[PDB]
Amino acid sequence: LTLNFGPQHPAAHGVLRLVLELDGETVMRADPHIGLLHRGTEKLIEYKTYTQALPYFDRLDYVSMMCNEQCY
Amino acid sequence: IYYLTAKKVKRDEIEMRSAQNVIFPILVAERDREFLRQLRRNRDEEAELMK
Amino acid sequence: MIQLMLYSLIITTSIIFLNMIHPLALGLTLLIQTIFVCLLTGLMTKSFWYSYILFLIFLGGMLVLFIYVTSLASNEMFNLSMKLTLFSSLILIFMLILSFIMDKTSSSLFLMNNDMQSIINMNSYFMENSLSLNKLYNFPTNFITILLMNYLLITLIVIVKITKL
Amino acid sequence: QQTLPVAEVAQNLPKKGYSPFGTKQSSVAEWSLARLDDLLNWGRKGSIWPLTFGLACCAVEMMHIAAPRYDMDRYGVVFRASPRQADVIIVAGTLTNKMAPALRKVYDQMPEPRWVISMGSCANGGGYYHYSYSVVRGCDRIIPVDIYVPGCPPTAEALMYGVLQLQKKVKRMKTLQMWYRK
Amino acid sequence: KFLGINRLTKLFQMVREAGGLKQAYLKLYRNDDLKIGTLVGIDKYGNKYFENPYYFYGRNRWIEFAPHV
Amino acid sequence: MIMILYWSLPMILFILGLFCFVSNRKHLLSMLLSLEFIVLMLFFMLFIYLNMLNYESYFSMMFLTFSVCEGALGLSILVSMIRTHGNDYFQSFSI
Amino acid sequence: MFSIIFIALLILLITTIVMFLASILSKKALIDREKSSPFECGFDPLPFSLRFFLITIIFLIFDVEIALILPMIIIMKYSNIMIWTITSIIFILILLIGLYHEWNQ
Amino acid sequence: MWFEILPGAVIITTLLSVPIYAMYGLDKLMIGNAFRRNMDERFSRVMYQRDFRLTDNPYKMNGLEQIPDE
Amino acid sequence: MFYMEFILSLIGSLLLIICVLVSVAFLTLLERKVLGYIQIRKGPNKVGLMGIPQPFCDAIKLFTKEQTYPLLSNYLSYYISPIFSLFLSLFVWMCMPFFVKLYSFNLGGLFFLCCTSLGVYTVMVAGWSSNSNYALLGGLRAVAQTISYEVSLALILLSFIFLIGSYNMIYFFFYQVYMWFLIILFPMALVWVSISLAETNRTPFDFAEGESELVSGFNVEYSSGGFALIFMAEYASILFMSMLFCVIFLGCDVFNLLFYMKLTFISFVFIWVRGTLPRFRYDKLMYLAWKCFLSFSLNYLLFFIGFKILLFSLL
Amino acid sequence: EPKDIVEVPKGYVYVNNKELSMEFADITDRAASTMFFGELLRGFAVTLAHIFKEPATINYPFEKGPLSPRFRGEHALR
Numbered sequence A: 001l002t003l004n005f006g007p008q009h010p011a012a013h014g015v016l017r018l019v020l021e022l023d024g025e026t027v028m029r030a031d032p033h034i035g036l037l038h039r040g041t042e043k044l045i046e047y048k049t050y051t052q053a054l055p056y057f058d059r060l061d062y063v064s065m066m067c068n069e070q071c072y
Numbered sequence B: 001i002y003y004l005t006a007k008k009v010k011r012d013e014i015e016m017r018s019a020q021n022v023i024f025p026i027l028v029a030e031r032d033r034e035f036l037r038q039l040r041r042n043r044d045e046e047a048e049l050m051k
Numbered sequence C: 001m002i003q004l005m006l007y008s009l010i011i012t013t014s015i016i017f018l019n020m021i022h023p024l025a026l027g028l029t030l031l032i033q034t035i036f037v038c039l040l041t042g043l044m045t046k047s048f049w050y051s052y053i054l055f056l057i058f059l060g061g062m063l064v065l066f067i068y069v070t071s072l073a074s075n076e077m078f079n080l081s082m083k084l085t086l087f088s089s090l091i092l093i094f095m096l097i098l099s100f101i102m103d104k105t106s107s108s109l110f111l112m113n114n115d116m117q118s119i120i121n122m123n124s125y126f127m128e129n130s131l132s133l134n135k136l137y138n139f140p141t142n143f144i145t146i147l148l149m150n151y152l153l154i155t156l157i158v159i160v161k162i163t164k165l
Numbered sequence D: 001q002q003t004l005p006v007a008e009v010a011q012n013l014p015k016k017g018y019s020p021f022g023t024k025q026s027s028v029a030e031w032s033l034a035r036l037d038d039l040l041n042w043g044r045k046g047s048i049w050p051l052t053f054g055l056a057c058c059a060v061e062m063m064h065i066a067a068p069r070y071d072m073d074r075y076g077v078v079f080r081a082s083p084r085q086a087d088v089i090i091v092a093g094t095l096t097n098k099m100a101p102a103l104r105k106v107y108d109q110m111p112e113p114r115w116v117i118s119m120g121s122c123a124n125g126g127g128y129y130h131y132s133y134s135v136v137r138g139c140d141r142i143i144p145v146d147i148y149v150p151g152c153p154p155t156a157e158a159l160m161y162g163v164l165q166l167q168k169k170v171k172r173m174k175t176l177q178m179w180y181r182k
Numbered sequence E: 001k002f003l004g005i006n007r008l009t010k011l012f013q014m015v016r017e018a019g020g021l022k023q024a025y026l027k028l029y030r031n032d033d034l035k036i037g038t039l040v041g042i043d044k045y046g047n048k049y050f051e052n053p054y055y056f057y058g059r060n061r062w063i064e065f066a067p068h069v
Numbered sequence F: 001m002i003m004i005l006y007w008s009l010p011m012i013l014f015i016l017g018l019f020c021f022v023s024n025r026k027h028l029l030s031m032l033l034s035l036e037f038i039v040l041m042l043f044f045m046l047f048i049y050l051n052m053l054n055y056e057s058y059f060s061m062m063f064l065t066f067s068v069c070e071g072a073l074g075l076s077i078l079v080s081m082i083r084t085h086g087n088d089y090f091q092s093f094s095i
Numbered sequence G: 001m002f003s004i005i006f007i008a009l010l011i012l013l014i015t016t017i018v019m020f021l022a023s024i025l026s027k028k029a030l031i032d033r034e035k036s037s038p039f040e041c042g043f044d045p046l047p048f049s050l051r052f053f054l055i056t057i058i059f060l061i062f063d064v065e066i067a068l069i070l071p072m073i074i075i076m077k078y079s080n081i082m083i084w085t086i087t088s089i090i091f092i093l094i095l096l097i098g099l100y101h102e103w104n105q
Numbered sequence H: 001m002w003f004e005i006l007p008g009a010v011i012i013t014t015l016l017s018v019p020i021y022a023m024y025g026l027d028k029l030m031i032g033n034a035f036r037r038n039m040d041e042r043f044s045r046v047m048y049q050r051d052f053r054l055t056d057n058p059y060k061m062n063g064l065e066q067i068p069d070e
Numbered sequence I: 001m002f003y004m005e006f007i008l009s010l011i012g013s014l015l016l017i018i019c020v021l022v023s024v025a026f027l028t029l030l031e032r033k034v035l036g037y038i039q040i041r042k043g044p045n046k047v048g049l050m051g052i053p054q055p056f057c058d059a060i061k062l063f064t065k066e067q068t069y070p071l072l073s074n075y076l077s078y079y080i081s082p083i084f085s086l087f088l089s090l091f092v093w094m095c096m097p098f099f100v101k102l103y104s105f106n107l108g109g110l111f112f113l114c115c116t117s118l119g120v121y122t123v124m125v126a127g128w129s130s131n132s133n134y135a136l137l138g139g140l141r142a143v144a145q146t147i148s149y150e151v152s153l154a155l156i157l158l159s160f161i162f163l164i165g166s167y168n169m170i171y172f173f174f175y176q177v178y179m180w181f182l183i184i185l186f187p188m189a190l191v192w193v194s195i196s197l198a199e200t201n202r203t204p205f206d207f208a209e210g211e212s213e214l215v216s217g218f219n220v221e222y223s224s225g226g227f228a229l230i231f232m233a234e235y236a237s238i239l240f241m242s243m244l245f246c247v248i249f250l251g252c253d254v255f256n257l258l259f260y261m262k263l264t265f266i267s268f269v270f271i272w273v274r275g276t277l278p279r280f281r282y283d284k285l286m287y288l289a290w291k292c293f294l295s296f297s298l299n300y301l302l303f304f305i306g307f308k309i310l311l312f313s314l315l
Numbered sequence J: 001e002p003k004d005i006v007e008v009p010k011g012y013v014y015v016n017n018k019e020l021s022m023e024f025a026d027i028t029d030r031a032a033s034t035m036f037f038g039e040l041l042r043g044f045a046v047t048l049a050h051i052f053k054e055p056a057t058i059n060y061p062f063e064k065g066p067l068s069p070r071f072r073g074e075h076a077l078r
């Protein structure tokens, strides 16, 4: 059974697409498909200055805000 | 406590069964008289129908 | 009267069981036949124990295997036809009005119920579903139900071997 | 705009009432259809079930109306995971190019009436990735949107203000009056 | 009190301070909770701002809007 | 007569289920479901027999146990060909 | 039992009438290609499992076994006590030994 | 505060108390006897049959006034 | 045969059905309210007055939305699952112990086991006809857990029938005239709570119909009236399990208002375990249903076989 | 007090490092907690104690939550 834990699914974080092959309840294979929330951050940093690219890191890992700003 | 409750339920159903055994033979005699009478009318009806 | 209604319903479900071919639809026809068979065997008997036993064993216990296998066997849905529904309804109304125009005393079954027995019958007043089930748990017929439980365990041993797990 | 009415002026104003249509309908059939539409809109605004569609950071505020301080459950609002059982889809996050057919299919499998709330600057207008190669310039090009909540992470009072504005839109829905005038 | 009987007369004086039982009914129907508080402000638009530090933070200040709407 | 008016219908439906069991227009799952249809009709006729006697109805769960073990045996025979004959063997019209 | 048929047919008739009136009261919109599609999360799209089938078979064997444990509450006041106790203790003990043996193997 | 649950629960206590209590009124209205006759044992069914044979209402009493003077 | 028996049986059954349905609506209100109070948050409010007509807001909305279908051509098999689900949930209530006679069910436990054995059938037609792999997985998982605790439930109720000596539900009243069965059967009380949260899909046994591992097990394609009938059927099953806990363990007390207060309290307990416990797994639930509960069932059935033999000599 | 499987250093803290106890008192305590749902009873009691707590629902829009003077909202031209 091929199955999609797609972006609608709540155990996924809203953009994960887990294409998983199932023999019964067991998971024989699980390929994560990502890039559904790819926003082209590294292409957009180079067209802006340092203080303009500082708010990108707040939106990168968005449960760790001040740590990302601290790292940048 | 369940043993005492089951003893109470047992004596209640034994009281009901003894009352049933009292009521029973009068109703048996009444059924006997009606059964013999109905057998007589059934034999008479079968005799007059099959002439 | 209601015995003739169950006769008509069993006839109608049997002829549509003969007509249809989709395997889950035959499974649905079996599960709705089992209810009418349970009720109709309940009309002849003193009490409804064996209808309940047939119900738990056959419908809720065994036919769920058939429903699961026939559900995973067929990918497609039912193709409902209004012609077969109309023919089943027409033969059902015809058989109910045929039971209306027929004497129900001659068509009733000769098997005695709990109230069709004599009033002076001592055995009927004792306890509901007591004397019929008595021979299951008395000498010398208890060896058959011990052999039946052993037979069910041996059946499970057979089934594990033949499916190969 | 209009100046909000001064209390000297507003004391002379009568009460608005619950019904936006008013009870001054002429025909008895038109009045009956107006009250039936009022009851239908009250039932629809009394419980809207939004869908668990959280794409990006905005959704971290979306759970913050689930949170005990703001408490969306006393507004008829409770999350449903399946798109069939849900009324509303809240686009809360960044719709990308790989995300577009998934959002369109999830919206199309939702049953009508379908109100859509765009939560956040990535949901409406593209926002902070508006000039990106793989970000759709707002979700208005794909899914038709009824309420647009403005803030980059909308505060949760502002998202719930969008929810109350959607409830006012649902209360203003005219279906049976339009059927009588069709 | 240990049991909480003295909150019933607080509910009763809430009813009397609302203006009766019908006015308390339409206050409970409109404002989702019944509260007492010191009247702090009245706008030119007719709103009424009440404050009472008995409640916890976030609930100690409330608006009651103008009664023409 | 007695056979025409009483217990005629289980015979007719038993022959109908037997003809559904052996017809070439059906498949193996239809054979098994028609087999349990004649199991139900056999229970009907056996209960009509067993209720002429008063207190011998306890045999009805013996035949039930044997025929239910037959049905589970037939299903476990039929699904044991899934890993060998594939999932398309349920549509086989011939053996 | 004849009243049970009447009340069950009335419950079935009331539920079908309520669902028919719900289908009338449901808002009829234009039917679509994607709206009729089966729901897979997001992007659009099982074999036979033997373990669940033997779960159903174990359920069936234990169900037919329970159908022989069912009568003996009534028979306890109307049978030989020694025979009834021997059959009940043997019945549940062989069931427990079989369950523990299938657990260990 | 926490007493707002009791609007949603006590009503549940009332409604499910309806289908017996109304019958405890209603059997006192059209029958006159508050309890319908129990049909579990066969002897109760036979004696109920005897009552419905004796009077057209089986819950109507045939007391000692039925007995003729002798 | 006297016709007022039929008339009053019909009136009492229809009144029972109506009151059960309105109690289902108010049970959904109670669950949304106190399930909020399980956490810090409030329950429903702001609709009508103090959130009371919120289930009527649910009922107006669910009976108006577009009845969508999992496929466009043939969908009559999609209809037959909520009809039979609500039919069984309103039909199982006929074996309630009524002291004023409504139906003389001398075998009520077998009737309850029959309706529970159809629960698997309505959820199996719920799973298959919805044409989705999530729907088939949820239907197979629900059929798996319900037939896994069907055997356990049959053995537990079969152990309880040994105490009263018959299958008549009103015989639970006469054996509870001095004390409740909660005192004597407290591990059976915990096991029966674990049983009653398994046949009806609640949070402790929610791998069948959860929102985490599946989006929805068998309500995934059901909406706009079918979901309303399924939801009402499941909450009627919750009400039936609360009543059946209150008859067996707590004294039947059918007339007293304290019985219905305890029924609302056991519904409160059902919503109390709704907010507390996490969800079991498939392997751990096969371990629970077939080894622990089965071994406890057979062992304590042996205990009551010995106890009912010991009291039979003494009485 | 169970013994340590791994010796805990000065700058670190170890979780699930306790040995499983083998004396009969601790085995009977763990057995009674397994059989009679003691830890589930503690979880149920902790859950039920939060019904009696004050709700934190701030009743929007009659009462609005705290803000700050630095708060960023609608841009405006002074």
Ligand code: SF4
Pocket (backbone or CB within 6 Å): A059, D056, D057, D058, D092, D093, D094, D119, D120, D121, D122, D123, D127, D128, D151, D152, D153, D154
């Ligand atoms: S609008 Fe702002 S907060 Fe929302 S997803 Fe985009 S960057 Fe994040």
